Enzyme design. Structure first.
Site, mmCIF file in Angstrom:
data_model
loop_
_atom_site.group_PDB
_atom_site.id
_atom_site.type_symbol
_atom_site.label_atom_id
_atom_site.label_comp_id
_atom_site.label_asym_id
_atom_site.label_seq_id
_atom_site.Cartn_x
_atom_site.Cartn_y
_atom_site.Cartn_z
ATOM 1 N NE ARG A 70 -0.363 0.248 4.934
ATOM 2 C CZ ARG A 70 -0.679 -0.209 6.138
ATOM 3 N NH1 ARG A 70 -1.691 -1.062 6.290
ATOM 4 N NH2 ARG A 70 0.038 0.177 7.187
ATOM 5 N NE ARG A 72 -1.299 3.893 6.134
ATOM 6 C CZ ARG A 72 -1.648 3.125 7.155
ATOM 7 N NH1 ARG A 72 -0.932 3.134 8.277
ATOM 8 N NH2 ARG A 72 -2.709 2.328 7.040
ATOM 9 C CE1 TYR A 165 -6.428 4.679 10.215
ATOM 10 C CE2 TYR A 165 -6.877 3.525 8.159
ATOM 11 C CZ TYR A 165 -6.019 3.830 9.205
ATOM 12 O OH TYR A 165 -4.750 3.276 9.251
ATOM 13 C CD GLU A 232 -5.657 -1.545 14.147
ATOM 14 O OE1 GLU A 232 -4.588 -0.899 14.191
ATOM 15 O OE2 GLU A 232 -6.118 -2.032 13.094
ATOM 16 C CE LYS A 264 -8.622 0.723 9.586
ATOM 17 N NZ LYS A 264 -7.700 0.094 10.567
HETATM 18 MN MN LIG Z 1 -3.986 -1.886 11.986
#
Ligand SMILES: [Mn+2]
Ligand code: NA
Length: 286
Positions: A70, A72, A165, A232, A264
């Protein structure tokens, strides 16, 4: 001995849960006047996979060494630093763990790097010239970038799903015995071109959205707005003690619902590409 667990939190219990946590831990901030704007809490990741969804099935089954890739960034659309991240699933006698590795890339170099036009040497030329970071650490970063670039090209990865998020980090710095993150506004967005719609226009991310949750401009089919917050908990308990009394009480409390293997990435693929996937995580129907 370090443990990580994940939970879903109903919108009705978010505030009560916040009050409990903040009793024990500070919230991290990143501006020196300790003020923050809406976008400061934003975390956006673009997950890559190929058309067969190889990486998705690997992570789903928890294959040993199964990779997720990913790109980010933190904060708003003015953020220029993009972290190229690789998360690796590990299993052995001791149990399971997750290994994360990343290196940073300027936004304007991302496409060129993913196509293998901007080489890893070119990527790190400025970093080597600077001479700030030790040589071995640089060599190990270059090795990571080469490995990532190789898989991206070899497995023909492309953008598939975006997670968005807002994250609050509860953490007493210099004390990682306990670290808690609460993720709200959790959203997954389609970035793939599997139905023929060229969503990113061959960029590494869609550009028709930013961090402007709730993203009303998206087609219904391109977005999953997740109903719950995700909590988490990252523990580092000094053997052979137990986790703090307040932490253990919390997790067992009615406030949170444990979902062991939650992801996710996996949630997004399975929900958004539901007609395409042949296997489904167990927090979803069948
Ligand atoms: Mn996580
Ligand atoms: Na840039």
């Amino acid at each position: 001995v370090r443990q990580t667990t994940k939970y879903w939190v109903h919108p009705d219990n978010i505030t009560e849960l916040k009050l409990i946590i903040l009793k024990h831990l500070p919230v991290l901030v990143f501006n020196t006047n300790k003020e923050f704007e809406r976008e400061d809490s934003a975390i956006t990741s673009i997950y890559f996979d190929n058309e067969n969804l190889d990486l998705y099935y690997g992570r789903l089954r928890k294959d040993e060494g199964a990779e997720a890739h990913r790109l980010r960034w933190y904060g708003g659309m003015s953020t220029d630093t993009i972290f190229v991240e690789r998360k690796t699933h590990r299993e052995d006698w001791t149990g399971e763990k997750s290994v994360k590795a990343r290196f940073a890339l300027k936004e304007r170099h991302v496409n060129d790097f993913l196509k293998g036009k901007y080489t890893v040497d070119q990527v790190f030329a400025k970093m080597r010239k600077e001479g700030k970071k030790p040589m071995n650490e640089i060599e190990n970063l270059e090795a990571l970038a080469s490995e990532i670039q190789y898989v991206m090209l070899k497995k023909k990865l492309r953008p598939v799903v975006r997670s968005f998020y807002n994250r609050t980090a509860f953490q007493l710095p210099g004390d990682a015995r306990v670290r808690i993150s609460l993720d709200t506004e959790l959203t997954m967005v389609r970035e793939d071109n599997f139905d023929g719609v060229d969503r990113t226009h061959k960029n590494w991310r869609r550009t028709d959205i930013g961090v402007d949750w709730p993203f009303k401009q998206l087609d219904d089919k391109d977005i999953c707005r997740f109903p719950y917050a995700v909590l988490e908990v990252k523990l580092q308990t000094q053997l052979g003690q137990e986790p703090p009394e307040w932490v253990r009480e919390l997790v067992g409390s009615h406030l949170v619902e444990p979902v062991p293997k939650f992801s996710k990435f996996i949630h997004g693929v399975a929900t958004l590409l539901n007609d395409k996937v042949d296997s489904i995580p167990f927090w979803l129907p069948q």
